[PDB]
Amino acid sequence: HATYGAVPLTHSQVTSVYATDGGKVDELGLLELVEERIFSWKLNKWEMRIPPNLPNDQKELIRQEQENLKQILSEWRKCFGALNADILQISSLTGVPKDVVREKNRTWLQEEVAKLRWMGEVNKAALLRDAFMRLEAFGSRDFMFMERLCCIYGLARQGTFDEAFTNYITEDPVTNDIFVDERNPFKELVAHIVRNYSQIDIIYDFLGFNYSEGYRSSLRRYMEYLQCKTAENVRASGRLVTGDKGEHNILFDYCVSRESLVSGDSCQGIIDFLYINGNDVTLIIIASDNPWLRNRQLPHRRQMEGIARRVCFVLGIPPSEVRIRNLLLPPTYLDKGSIVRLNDIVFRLSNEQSNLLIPWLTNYNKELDPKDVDYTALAKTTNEEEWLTL
Amino acid sequence: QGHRLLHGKREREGSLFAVANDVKRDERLLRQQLNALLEEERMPTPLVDLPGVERRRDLPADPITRLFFQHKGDHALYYGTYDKPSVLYTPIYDFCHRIREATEQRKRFVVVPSTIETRGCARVMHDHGLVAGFRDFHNDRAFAVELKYFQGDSTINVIEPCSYDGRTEFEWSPKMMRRLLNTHGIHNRLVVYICRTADNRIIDHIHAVKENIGGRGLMMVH
Amino acid sequence: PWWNFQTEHRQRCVLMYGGARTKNTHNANHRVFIKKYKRNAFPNRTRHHWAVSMTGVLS
Amino acid sequence: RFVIRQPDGTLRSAKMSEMRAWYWKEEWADFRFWAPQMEWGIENTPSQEQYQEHVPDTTDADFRKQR
Amino acid sequence: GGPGSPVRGPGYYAPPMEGEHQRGYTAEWRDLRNPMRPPEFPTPWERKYRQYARGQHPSYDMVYAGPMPEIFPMRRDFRKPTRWDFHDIEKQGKYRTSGPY
Amino acid sequence: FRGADTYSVKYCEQGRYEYQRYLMINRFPSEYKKHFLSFLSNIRMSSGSAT
Amino acid sequence: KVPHSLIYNIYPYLEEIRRRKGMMAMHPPGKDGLLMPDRVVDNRLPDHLKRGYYDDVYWKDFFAGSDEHLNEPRMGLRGDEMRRRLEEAQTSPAPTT
Amino acid sequence: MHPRLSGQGVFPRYGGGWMHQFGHVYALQQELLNAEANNWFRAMELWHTARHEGVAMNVSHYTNILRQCVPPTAWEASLMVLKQMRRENIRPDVVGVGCALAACADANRSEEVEKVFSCFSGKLKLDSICYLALIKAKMSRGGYAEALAVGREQDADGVPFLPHTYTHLLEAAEVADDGEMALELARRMSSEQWPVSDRGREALKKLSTRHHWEEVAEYK
RNA sequence: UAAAUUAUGGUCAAUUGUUAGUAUUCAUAUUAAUUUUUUUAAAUGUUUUAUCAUUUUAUAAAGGUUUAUUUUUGAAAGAUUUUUUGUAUAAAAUUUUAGGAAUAGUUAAUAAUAAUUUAUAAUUUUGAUUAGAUUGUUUUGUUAAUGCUAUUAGAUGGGUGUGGAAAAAUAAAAAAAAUAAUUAAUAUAU
Ligand SMILES: [Mg+2]
Ligand SMILES: [Mg+2]
C-alpha cells in the first residue's frame, strides 16, 4: 500500500528501477497472468494507494488517474468475462474443444448453425450465431493490447502497486503443496515493457491516461523523433529543432496554450507548435477543454497570412509557393485519425512508411469520444480546409 | 493580482454600459448591431436569418427542427425583434392578462414576454390546440402568440393564472394533479392545468399524472 | 382501505388510556361575556380585555 | 401463527376462513379466471437469468444456511 | 404533523419550496393514495418489480358479494358497541363514503 | 364501506428489507463517543449466569 | 380535436395531446438517414413469425460473401508483427554507445 | 429435486402472482417448456400429466416435444403428436413440422415424409429445411430425378436456396446424370456467394469430368 | 416578390358502457321545547413482623395557576460475582386581549462550591413585564372546504431531609414477600 515516503514516478525512474535483464519474455502470457492477479482483487485493494505527503492538487490528479485506471481495468474485466462466457457457450453448444474455437471459420459457423437448425433447435442456433458474431470482433488475445500495456505501465507509474503482486499463498495443482510465492510477474512484465517499448510514455500520454501534464510534451518528443528519422541531420536548441540541409525542416515550440489562454481576454490565435516543412507551414494547435475558448484558439485568415508573410521574410522563400494550414488536436488524448493526419500533413508520410518508421502505429486503436460533438464539428471544418496560399 | 467580483446578471453577462451612469438601460439592440458589425463576408459562408445556437451540443435532437437552427458562435445571442411589453406582477400573470384582453378584441397576434415558464405554457397550449402558432419563438425576451379562431368566436374561453392575486404561489402535489385530472366527478382532459416540475419542464396535468409527479402550478386555460 | 393518521392516533390513545375519547364535548354552550369595570377604565396599560379571549398555544 | 386449543386439549392450526377472519373483509368473487389456463409458451416466459440478476449468494449472505 | 406524525407536507397545495424539498414534495415522498403505482423502492429494487408496480388487481370481474347499500333512509352514523370485533378502532371515526356504489 | 378493496401485486411479490432506503442519520460527536463506549461495554460483558 | 379524446380515459388519446411530429423524426434513423418505421422488416413483422422463413431469407446476410469473408478467421493475433519488429529492434543493436 | 423457479417475483401480474394453490402448475409448465431437456421419453410422459392436471398447452409445448424426438429419431413419436394436434385443431408451426419432417427423414421413412409434407404444403409457408427432408426422402429410394423436382418446387414457392439444399441437389444430379440441371445450380451458388460443402465440391468435379461443361465455359 | 408539384394506389367513422376523485340546494342541517331516562344520604378492616418499635406498601378532591416535556445510577427487575458504579436534571418550536410602554434579587466574565471584583450588561415597538381570561391536546361538531367551532392527560419551592425518587393525610385491585381464592354470571347493594 501507500507508505510514508512513497512518490509518483516519471518515465526515468520507471526505466531505472525496473531495469532487469530478460530473454524471450512472453508478452501475452505475462499480460494474462498479471491481469488475472488484478481481476482476483476486490475494491478494497484500490483504497490506500495514494501517497500521503503530497499537496492536494497533486493528490487530486493522482486520484483521477488511478480512478481512470480502475474503470478501464474493470471494463476490460467485464469484457474478458463476456469473452470467456461466449467461448464456453460456443464450446458447449457445438461440442468442439475450447482451445480450437479461436481458430474456427465462418464456413464452420454456417455448418454448425445449419446442424443446430436441422435438429430443431433454432434458439441454440441463434445463440451460437450471435456469440460467434460478437466473438469475431472481441475474441483476439491482443484486442486492447496497447491499452492494457499502458494500464500496467500506469500501475507501475503510480509506484504503489509493485508489492501487490507477490507474497501470495498458493497450492501446487498436482502435489497440493501449500507454499508462498515470491515471484513478481508485474515487475518482469513492466521490465519487458520498458525494454521493448521504448516509446511507452508516448503511447501512455496519447491514450489520455496522463492527467497531470497531458500529452503535449509527448507530442513534442514524438514529432522530434519523427523529424530525426526523416531529415536525418538535426540540431536541437531548447525549443527549436532545425534541419541543416538548406531545405526548411523547422519545428518551433511556441508556447503552452493551456496557460496562455487567459479566460476573459480578447486575443485571437494562440498556437502550440509551428512546423515548416519545405514550402508548407503547419500551425499545430491542441484544443482546450473550454468550448468558449476553442473559437478563440484558432487564428484568423489574416493572422495566418501574416505568419506566412513573416516566413517569406525570414526564410527567404518566395511567396508564390507558400502554404499555411491550421491543425486541431483533441484536448485530453490523441486518437488514431489525428496521428494519421499528423503524419500525412506535417511530415508528408503515407501509411506504409509511417508503419515502417513506427511499429506501434498499426495496433493503435484510439478513436474520438462520442460525447464531444462540438470539437468534432470544429475539427471537421478545420481539417477539411484547403491550404491558405499567400 | 486581485480582480473585481462580477455582481449581478448584468456584469456576469458582460454588459458594456454604453449609456452614461445608467445600469438598467436596455442593451440588446446596440449589442445586436455591434455583433452584426463583427461578422464579415469571407471570400476564398455568411449566416442566415434562421435562429442559431452558440454550441453544437445545443442543437435540437429532432432532425426536422435542426433544419431550422444553425450554429453561430457569438452571433447566436441577442436574437429577436420584439421587446419586453409594458403597461404586471408575474410574467405568468401578464401572459394570461394579455391573451385574455386580446382574445376579446379579436386580434391575430399577442406579444407576450418570453420567460422559461411562459414559452413552455405556450407550447403546452399549442399542443392542446388552443393556440394556432407563434412568431419569433426563439426570442428570449418576447414572442408573439398567433391565436386560434373558429366560426367567429375565440378558441380560448377562460385563461387564468394560479397566482390570482399575483403574489402567492402554490406547490401542487401529485395528489393535486390527480384531483385536477378527475375534477367534479368526471375525467378532465378539457380544462388544461399546467405546472412546472423540479426539473424545470413545463408539464400539463395529464402527463403529470402519467408519471406521478407534481410541480408549481402556473395557470389554467380552456 | 388505507386508514389515515387519525386512526393510528386513536389506536395509540386506546392502547394508552383504554378508550379513545368520551363523547359530547361540544355542547354548543353560550359563552356570555359579563363586564365589570368602567368604559375606559380597564386595569391594564396596554391590552384592555373586553371580549371572550380564546386560550390555546397551537389550537 | 394461529393456534386453536380444542376443549379436549388438542392444539391444532386454524382453517382458511379462521385465518381470514382476523383481517379486513374481502367481499368479492372471481367467477372467470382459472390459473391452469394461463399462456406460458409465447410471451409469458420467466427466465432463470432474470432471477439471477438479484445475485443471491451463500458466501456473501449466510441467512439461508443459518435457517 | 411534527412530533410523532409521519406527515411531511400538505395534501394538495403548498407554499413554494426550494432545493430537495421541491423535489421531495412533488416527486419523491410516499403516496399510498396513488391508484396506479405504489410508493417506490430504492435502487435496485424497482427494476425487478416493474411489472408488479402497476394497477391494483388484474381481474376487473369482481362480482360484489357483500351487503347492498341502503338508499332510504340514509343512516349517518354507524356506531355499535361490539364484543368480538378486533377492528373496532378502524371501524370508528368519520370516513368519507365515496365509491362506485 | 370498503367491503371489496384489493391492493397492488407489488406488496405481495416484494422480498424482505428491500423497501428500506439508505438514510444518513448524523448525530453529535459526543453522542458518537457515548454510543461507541456503550456498545463496547455491552460487547465485553463477561459470560456468567446472566449473560 | 375529437370530442371523445376530451372526456374519456383511454391511453392513445395521449397521442392527441402532443403536437404533430414526423414519424421519421421520432423513430431512430438507419444507416442511410431518416427511415420510416414500417420500412424495416423487424418492426412490421411480429415476433412469432420470425423463426421459420425469416432466417431462411436472411441467411445471406451472415453466411454469404467472398472467399476472404468466409475463409479467413478474425480471432487471430493482430499484433504479432509489431511484437516481432520491436523484439528484433531491441535485440539487434544490443548496446548503448 | 426442486422447482427451478419457486415464486415471489418471477410469475406475471395477470395470473395474480404466485398463487400458492397452483404451485404445482407453475412447476409443471417449466418442465414442459425446458429448453435444456433432451429426453424424448419424458416429453411424452410430461404431456400425459399436463393432460391430467388440466394444463393449457399451446403450440410451444408441442414444439418442445417434437424437438426432442429428432436426435433419437423417434419417427413414431413425432406422428402421434401431430395426430393429437390435428385432433384438437392446434395448428403446428413451421419449426414444429420441420422437426417431424427431420425425425422421419433420418429414419428412412420416405413414405411418411411425403404424406406429412402434403398435409402442410399449401397452407404452411414451409422452409428450406422442410424442403430438405423431402429431398432426403426422395434420394433414399433412388428418386434422384424426383428429388430435383422438389428443388423446382422449392424455387416455385419462393423459398430461397441454402448451402444444405445445394449439397443434396448436386448429389441428386450424380445418379440422374442431369448435367443441365447442375448447370443452373452451380451458376446460382456463385451469384449468391455460398460456401460449397465438401460433398458439393466432389459432386461438381464428377459432372465436370463426364460432361466437360466447366472446361468449355471457364467456370471453376 | 416562387408563382398551385397531380396514379385520388385505398375510403369503409363513432358507440359494447370496466371507474387516476374536495364538489357546492341562503334554505336546509345543528341546538332547547312538543319528549328525556336512571340512580346516589357520609360516619370507613390494607397486610406481615423480631412487640409500647422496626421491614414492604410514591400522584384523591376544592382552592391557588402553568410556553413546553421526559427519562431514578441508587429500591425492585436481578441471575454462584462485586464499587450508594449501570450517560435522568438539558435544547429548537408554537398562546390571547376594541382604546399597546417600559421591565428587573437583574446579563456576561470569573483561580468565584458559598461571586466584597470587572463590563460601553440583560428584556422590549419583529410587542416585553404587570393586569384580565386561562391545563394544554390533526381525538369534538359542521362543511365542497388547509375554514369556523370545542375538549376534563397532567403538574403543584416551608407537613416530615425520611426515602432511590415527596407524589404522602386519602383512590372498586395495580392481589401487597406460604397456591387465601383463579369453575362461571352478578363481582356490588348486603
Ligand atoms: Mg438493585
Ligand atoms: Mg474581573
Side-chain angles (χ1 to χ4, degrees), chain A, chain B, chain C, chain D residues 1-47 56 60-67, chain E, chain F, chain G residues 1-95, chain H:
Chain A
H1 287 57
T3 62
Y4 173 71
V7 280
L9 308 180
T10 181
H11 185 50
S12 300
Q13 28 195 348
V14 162
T15 309
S16 74
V17 163
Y18 295 93
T20 70
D21 300 69
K24 203 59 201 65
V25 177
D26 200 275
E27 279 170 38
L28 289 177
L30 270 194
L31 178 70
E32 288 170 5
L33 186 57
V34 168
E35 288 192 327
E36 183 190 351
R37 186 55 70 185
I38 286 176
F39 298 157
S40 59
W41 292 349
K42 301 186 177 304
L43 304 178
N44 284 327
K45 298 283 296 183
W46 295 86
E47 279 186 333
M48 293 168 291
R49 290 300 199 273
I50 307 173
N53 40 12
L54 279 184
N56 294 332
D57 44 0
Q58 187 176 358
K59 284 169 63 65
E60 195 60 56
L61 293 175
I62 284 178
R63 188 204 61 87
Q64 287 177 10
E65 184 172 342
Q66 288 182 10
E67 199 76 27
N68 179 81
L69 291 168
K70 179 184 178 180
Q71 65 160 104
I72 293 179
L73 282 177
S74 302
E75 284 167 31
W76 176 246
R77 186 175 73 172
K78 69 188 68 185
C79 180
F80 180 76
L83 279 176
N84 290 18
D86 290 317
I87 290 177
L88 181 60
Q89 188 181 32
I90 289 183
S91 183
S92 65
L93 289 179
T94 293
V96 87
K98 189 178 299 180
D99 53 313
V100 300
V101 177
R102 276 189 173 92
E103 59 100 21
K104 278 307 171 182
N105 214 8
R106 207 146 178 173
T107 309
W108 172 89
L109 174 64
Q110 187 266 333
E111 288 184 349
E112 291 301 318
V113 166
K115 280 182 179 181
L116 280 182
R117 201 191 155 193
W118 170 255
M119 309 312 294
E121 300 171 344
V122 287
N123 297 325
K124 292 182 174 60
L127 283 182
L128 172 67
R129 194 254 303 167
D130 284 324
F132 209 96
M133 278 305 113
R134 73 174 170 265
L135 206 66
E136 285 176 4
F138 297 90
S140 302
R141 293 185 59 186
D142 39 359
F143 170 59
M144 298 304 285
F145 183 78
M146 307 309 296
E147 286 81 17
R148 295 177 292 168
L149 255 55
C150 288
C151 282
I152 296 187
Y153 175 74
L155 254 56
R157 199 83 174 270
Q158 298 310 122
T160 61
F161 288 90
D162 43 328
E163 71 272 353
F165 290 86
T166 176
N167 293 331
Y168 281 95
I169 295 181
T170 43
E171 286 192 333
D172 285 323
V174 290
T175 63
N176 286 333
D177 299 306
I178 285 95
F179 72 104
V180 191
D181 39 273
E182 294 183 348
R183 177 177 182 265
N184 202 336
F186 177 77
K187 285 184 173 297
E188 309 167 0
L189 185 54
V190 166
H192 187 65
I193 282 170
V194 163
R195 184 171 63 252
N196 277 31
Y197 297 83
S198 58
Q199 294 187 315
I200 196 59
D201 48 349
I202 303 181
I203 315 166
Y204 182 78
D205 293 8
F206 278 3
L207 285 174
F209 282 93
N210 181 272
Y211 282 81
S212 298
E213 66 259 70
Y215 74 105
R216 189 189 179 274
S217 60
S218 295
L219 175 70
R220 187 199 185 274
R221 290 191 288 104
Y222 172 81
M223 291 187 306
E224 195 175 342
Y225 175 78
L226 209 52
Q227 184 181 354
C228 284
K229 300 196 68 178
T230 53
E232 305 275 0
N233 298 270
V234 159
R235 53 181 61 176
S237 56
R239 54 178 196 161
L240 185 57
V241 178
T242 321
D244 56 87
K245 270 74 52 188
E247 189 171 355
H248 311 96
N249 202 323
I250 305 175
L251 170 63
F252 178 60
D253 195 1
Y254 173 60
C255 79
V256 188
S257 302
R258 297 304 176 90
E259 289 84 9
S260 296
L261 281 173
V262 179
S263 297
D265 197 8
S266 60
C267 294
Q268 190 73 235
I270 288 96
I271 69 176
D272 282 314
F273 300 94
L274 164 62
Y275 202 94
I276 306 174
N277 188 20
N279 314 128
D280 295 1
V281 168
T282 310
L283 308 177
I284 305 160
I285 308 175
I286 297 178
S288 63
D289 291 314
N290 200 327
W292 281 268
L293 263 54
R294 298 194 185 101
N295 51 85
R296 208 184 74 189
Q297 205 172 356
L298 295 175
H300 204 57
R301 177 198 54 87
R302 181 170 165 264
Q303 187 176 170
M304 290 170 59
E305 285 180 349
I307 289 177
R309 178 164 32 90
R310 253 80 55 86
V311 167
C312 296
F313 287 162
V314 171
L315 299 183
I317 164 173
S320 50
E321 49 281 338
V322 165
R323 303 187 303 172
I324 172 164
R325 184 173 180 172
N326 274 324
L327 185 54
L328 195 63
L329 295 184
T332 62
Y333 58 92
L334 197 61
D335 51 312
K336 174 62 176 300
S338 301
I339 305 180
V340 164
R341 199 176 296 107
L342 184 79
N343 300 337
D344 289 15
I345 296 301
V346 180
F347 300 99
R348 305 175 186 175
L349 297 180
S350 65
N351 220 23
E352 46 268 6
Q353 41 189 339
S354 57
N355 284 134
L356 284 183
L357 292 181
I358 299 156
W360 55 268
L361 196 58
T362 315
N363 297 317
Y364 191 81
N365 301 329
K366 189 59 180 299
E367 51 187 358
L368 288 172
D369 61 305
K371 51 189 180 300
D372 206 326
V373 58
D374 37 349
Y375 166 68
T376 56
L378 187 55
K380 179 163 293 305
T381 54
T382 307
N383 298 331
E384 297 170 349
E385 203 160 20
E386 199 54 45
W387 296 78
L388 179 60
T389 309
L390 178 61
Chain B
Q1 176 255 338
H3 61 277
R4 193 188 56 87
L5 186 71
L6 300 178
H7 180 39
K9 71 171 190 302
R10 295 168 169 91
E11 294 183 342
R12 282 181 60 90
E13 288 289 334
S15 304
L16 310 176
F17 306 100
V19 179
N21 314 342
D22 206 328
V23 297
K24 302 179 180 180
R25 174 63 188 180
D26 188 64
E27 217 194 9
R28 194 190 60 177
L29 179 63
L30 168 66
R31 208 76 97 88
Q32 179 178 149
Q33 295 305 126
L34 287 175
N35 218 336
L37 277 178
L38 266 184
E39 62 187 356
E40 61 100 11
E41 322 174 312
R42 41 175 181 178
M43 307 300 174
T45 29
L47 304 173
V48 301
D49 227 292
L50 299 179
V53 285
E54 53 183 348
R55 307 266 70 89
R56 194 58 73 101
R57 76 170 84 93
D58 297 335
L59 275 178
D62 198 297
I64 304 183
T65 317
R66 202 186 286 107
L67 299 167
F68 290 86
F69 289 87
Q70 77 164 353
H71 177 265
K72 318 175 184 184
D74 275 351
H75 313 273
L77 314 172
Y78 323 110
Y79 175 79
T81 57
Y82 311 111
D83 304 84
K84 212 76 162 181
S86 60
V87 110
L88 284 84
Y89 314 99
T90 322
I92 290 297
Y93 194 91
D94 209 338
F95 170 75
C96 294
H97 164 73
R98 290 186 191 276
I99 294 183
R100 185 170 56 248
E101 76 165 350
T103 40
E104 301 173 7
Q105 301 167 356
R106 301 285 190 266
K107 289 189 174 303
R108 302 188 65 236
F109 306 100
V110 202
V111 182
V112 288
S114 183
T115 70
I116 305 108
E117 70 275 342
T118 292
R119 67 178 80 95
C121 273
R123 176 195 53 86
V124 171
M125 287 163 55
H126 181 46
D127 289 2
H128 284 261
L130 297 157
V131 158
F134 306 111
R135 310 294 167 181
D136 213 42
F137 195 71
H138 198 243
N139 183 25
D140 59 89
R141 178 153 297 171
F143 68 103
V145 172
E146 171 188 343
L147 304 172
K148 179 179 293 185
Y149 298 91
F150 180 74
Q151 294 180 352
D153 62 328
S154 181
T155 299
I156 299 175
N157 186 25
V158 168
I159 163 173
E160 299 287 338
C162 186
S163 59
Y164 71 103
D165 44 355
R167 299 170 288 104
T168 59
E169 303 199 297
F170 299 91
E171 273 285 335
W172 295 346
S173 60
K175 204 174 180 180
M176 181 70 171
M177 310 312 292
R178 276 186 279 104
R179 155 188 282 185
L180 290 175
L181 188 67
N182 286 28
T183 167
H184 295 281
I186 67 172
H187 188 259
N188 177 37
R189 294 180 181 260
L190 186 70
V191 183
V192 182
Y193 298 93
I194 319 187
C195 62
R196 172 180 60 87
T197 342
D199 327 276
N200 284 261
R201 36 183 298 181
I202 315 295
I203 294 302
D204 50 307
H205 77 290
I206 307 173
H207 293 265
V209 180
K210 190 216 174 302
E211 57 191 336
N212 310 274
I213 56 175
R216 183 165 310 176
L218 300 174
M219 41 91 69
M220 62 165 280
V221 47
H222 66 263
Chain C
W2 295 114
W3 316 105
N4 43 10
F5 174 67
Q6 297 190 15
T7 312
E8 188 180 356
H9 191 277
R10 190 194 315 116
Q11 181 206 26
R12 165 177 284 268
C13 290
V14 160
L15 296 193
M16 285 302 163
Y17 308 100
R21 180 56 81 189
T22 65
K23 305 179 185 183
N24 194 24
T25 71
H26 197 87
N27 298 85
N29 185 247
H30 194 179
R31 290 157 57 172
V32 50
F33 189 85
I34 294 102
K35 52 175 300 298
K36 289 191 172 300
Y37 315 102
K38 296 306 178 192
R39 184 142 297 179
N40 293 138
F42 189 82
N44 198 33
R45 282 180 163 88
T46 58
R47 314 301 295 272
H48 318 278
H49 179 240
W50 291 114
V52 180
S53 284
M54 50 187 62
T55 54
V57 184
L58 210 31
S59 65
Chain D
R1 288 172 287 183
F2 297 89
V3 83
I4 291 168
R5 181 171 297 278
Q6 295 184 348
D8 74 279
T10 305
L11 282 178
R12 66 166 178 89
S13 58
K15 302 178 277 184
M16 186 57 179
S17 53
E18 277 170 333
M19 291 192 300
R20 291 173 67 91
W22 291 89
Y23 289 89
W24 192 255
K25 47 183 179 182
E26 193 176 9
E27 292 172 343
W28 66 279
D30 198 299
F31 274 92
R32 294 200 56 166
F33 174 67
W34 180 240
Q37 298 173 355
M38 288 173 59
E39 196 270 320
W40 269 78
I42 305 180
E43 287 177 345
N44 179 29
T45 310
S47 299
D60 207 11
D62 65 295
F63 59 95
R64 203 67 260 168
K65 295 178 294 182
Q66 273 163 336
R67 295 187 84 94
Chain E
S5 177
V7 187
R8 310 189 64 172
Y12 301 98
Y13 55 96
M17 310 180 185
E18 302 88 10
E20 64 164 18
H21 313 311
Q22 167 76 243
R23 300 190 302 268
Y25 182 76
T26 61
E28 306 171 353
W29 286 351
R30 303 286 299 270
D31 205 337
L32 41 79
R33 299 294 181 175
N34 201 316
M36 179 62 187
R37 185 211 60 185
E40 291 181 320
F41 284 167
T43 338
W45 313 113
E46 263 295 324
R47 197 260 314 166
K48 67 176 186 177
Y49 297 141
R50 190 196 302 109
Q51 66 161 332
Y52 305 102
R54 48 176 68 114
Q56 309 190 36
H57 205 272
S59 54
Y60 296 90
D61 297 314
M62 311 171 62
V63 176
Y64 180 74
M68 293 304 185
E70 312 164 345
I71 58 179
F72 180 74
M74 286 173 177
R75 187 175 173 183
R76 178 167 297 186
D77 58 278
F78 293 86
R79 293 273 177 84
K80 298 182 58 182
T82 60
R83 287 169 288 180
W84 305 278
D85 191 16
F86 286 86
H87 286 275
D88 60 326
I89 302 177
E90 294 87 359
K91 279 197 180 182
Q92 62 189 1
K94 287 191 295 298
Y95 291 109
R96 296 205 300 110
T97 61
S98 301
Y101 285 76
Chain F
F1 178 77
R2 305 276 186 171
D5 203 5
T6 66
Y7 311 97
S8 180
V9 195
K10 189 192 172 183
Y11 289 111
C12 298
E13 291 299 292
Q14 51 166 317
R16 305 194 197 99
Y17 310 105
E18 306 185 7
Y19 74 105
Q20 283 283 343
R21 293 184 173 270
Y22 175 53
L23 296 178
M24 299 171 305
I25 311 183
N26 71 316
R27 48 188 67 89
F28 302 98
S30 61
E31 297 300 278
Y32 273 128
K33 177 206 169 185
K34 172 186 180 181
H35 288 307
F36 286 162
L37 260 62
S38 182
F39 282 139
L40 199 60
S41 182
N42 284 130
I43 282 174
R44 290 169 57 180
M45 277 298 304
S46 302
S47 181
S49 183
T51 296
Chain G
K1 303 282 181 299
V2 283
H4 295 291
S5 61
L6 297 183
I7 41 177
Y8 289 156
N9 187 21
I10 317 180
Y11 71 94
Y13 292 149
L14 197 68
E15 283 277 346
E16 315 300 313
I17 300 302
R18 297 182 300 268
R19 207 54 189 175
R20 266 177 172 87
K21 286 155 292 190
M23 286 174 290
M24 303 183 187
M26 302 183 298
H27 285 82
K31 57 174 181 54
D32 60 89
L34 292 188
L35 189 63
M36 289 295 301
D38 42 298
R39 294 312 302 161
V40 42
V41 164
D42 301 75
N43 284 175
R44 45 174 166 167
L45 195 64
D47 289 2
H48 73 283
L49 296 177
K50 287 181 176 177
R51 40 178 64 102
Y53 193 40
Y54 177 80
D55 50 355
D56 199 5
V57 166
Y58 283 164
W59 209 268
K60 44 172 287 299
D61 300 272
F62 317 109
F63 308 111
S66 63
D67 286 313
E68 276 71 30
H69 178 266
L70 297 175
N71 302 273
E72 163 182 299
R74 300 174 182 87
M75 295 171 293
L77 301 180
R78 66 189 64 171
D80 47 354
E81 185 184 10
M82 174 208 67
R83 188 172 301 111
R84 192 257 312 170
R85 280 182 54 184
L86 281 161
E87 186 67 34
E88 72 186 6
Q90 191 266 319
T91 310
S92 301
Chain H
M1 294 291 296
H2 61 272
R4 51 199 72 207
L5 294 177
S6 301
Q8 294 294 315
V10 87
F11 300 132
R13 193 195 78 93
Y14 68 96
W18 180 241
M19 299 189 62
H20 75 272
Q21 296 88 355
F22 308 100
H24 60 281
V25 192
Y26 298 144
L28 186 54
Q29 287 267 29
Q30 307 182 66
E31 302 293 329
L32 290 164
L33 300 151
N34 181 223
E36 308 290 330
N38 301 325
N39 188 20
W40 78 272
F41 208 96
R42 193 208 177 190
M44 315 297 280
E45 293 176 352
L46 278 180
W47 179 87
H48 278 276
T49 175
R51 194 200 198 186
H52 176 71
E53 289 301 294
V55 170
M57 312 174 76
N58 45 11
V59 78
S60 301
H61 290 73
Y62 294 95
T63 317
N64 195 31
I65 296 178
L66 291 163
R67 181 210 60 175
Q68 300 176 67
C69 298
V70 194
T73 331
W75 59 274
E76 295 179 355
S78 60
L79 299 187
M80 296 302 296
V81 171
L82 294 183
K83 181 193 173 187
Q84 191 68 30
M85 301 182 75
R86 188 170 56 250
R87 194 185 184 190
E88 311 178 9
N89 204 50
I90 298 181
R91 37 175 208 92
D93 46 352
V94 59
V95 189
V97 177
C99 289
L101 275 160
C104 296
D106 305 358
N108 300 324
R109 289 295 176 178
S110 304
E111 292 176 320
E112 307 178 8
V113 167
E114 299 169 355
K115 64 178 59 180
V116 81
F117 193 88
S118 61
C119 186
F120 304 99
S121 291
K123 39 169 59 183
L124 264 178
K125 185 58 181 179
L126 301 175
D127 277 354
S128 55
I129 285 191
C130 295
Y131 274 103
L132 189 66
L134 197 61
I135 292 174
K136 298 182 184 185
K138 290 291 185 178
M139 292 172 58
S140 63
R141 302 278 86 88
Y144 301 95
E146 307 176 10
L148 301 175
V150 188
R152 289 183 168 182
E153 191 184 338
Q154 184 183 166
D155 209 280
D157 206 10
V159 177
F161 273 44
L162 293 200
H164 52 240
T165 311
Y166 292 114
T167 307
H168 293 267
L169 283 184
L170 286 174
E171 288 174 350
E174 302 309 298
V175 197
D177 292 325
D178 216 333
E180 53 267 61
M181 178 74 64
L183 178 61
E184 301 115 5
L185 293 180
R187 287 182 180 182
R188 202 177 170 187
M189 298 181 73
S190 55
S191 61
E192 294 165 342
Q193 297 175 298
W194 290 118
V196 193
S197 182
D198 66 90
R199 317 183 70 179
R201 282 292 178 87
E202 53 93 8
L204 290 182
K205 295 307 175 184
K206 289 175 181 178
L207 289 182
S208 62
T209 310
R210 308 170 191 175
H211 296 253
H212 303 268
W213 58 277
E214 291 185 354
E215 304 148 0
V216 299
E218 268 291 306
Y219 171 70
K220 283 182 179 181

